[PDB]
Amino acid sequence: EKPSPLLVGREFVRQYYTLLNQAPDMLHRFYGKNSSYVHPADAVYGQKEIHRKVMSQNFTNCHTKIRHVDAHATLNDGVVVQVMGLLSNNNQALRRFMQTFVLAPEGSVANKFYVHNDIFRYQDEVF
């Protein structure tokens, strides 16, 4: 009675980068109040702030290359997703990245998730 975590992750990642490229300003409508967002720079928290952060980064004509994506079940019908790839902006240099997300039942509508955590880091910023 249970979607495939693995599948559920690729679907999410697909939705994520389409939307990050199409309209990155309802992007915050993926997260609830108690979410976490990053992209050394501290994470920011909840909708209004995650939304505000997304704006601050002028995401424009945003291209991706998802080179890898694991996902598993985690505590309480959650789903965690590792994702490694290349991301561009203002059609500039593609930079490697390493990403972790937690998806967790939204709970009102069944089999609908929300992003409790979205940790993203460029290898060139850390390595």
Place this chain on the structure above:
Amino acid sequence: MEKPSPLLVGREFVRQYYTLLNQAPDMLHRFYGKNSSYVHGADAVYGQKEIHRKVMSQNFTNCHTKIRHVDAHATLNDGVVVQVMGLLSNQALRRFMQTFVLAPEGSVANKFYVHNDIFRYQDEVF
């Protein structure tokens, strides 16, 4: 005040993990329970026993790490999610990425089990 700091449960976990990796890796199965999935280099083997078996497969001998940064944040049900970025020699350091999810044990707080452990060298992706 009611729950441990996440980052602190995060940065101390990594400490215990990769240390216990250079030290006896025939102990890591301690860290896990019977809902726990382990995924190194790739479908997850569950439980202390298979994960142990999987650990041992890897002949972790004089494992050398080098953490470059760590994110640990709070997730549902007082869980701590943890993305690690570093280099792992086990021999040339190999850029890597390890995601964890730490879940409250239940009986007592400040006490957690590793529900999840997903590893990928980068030079295998890309």
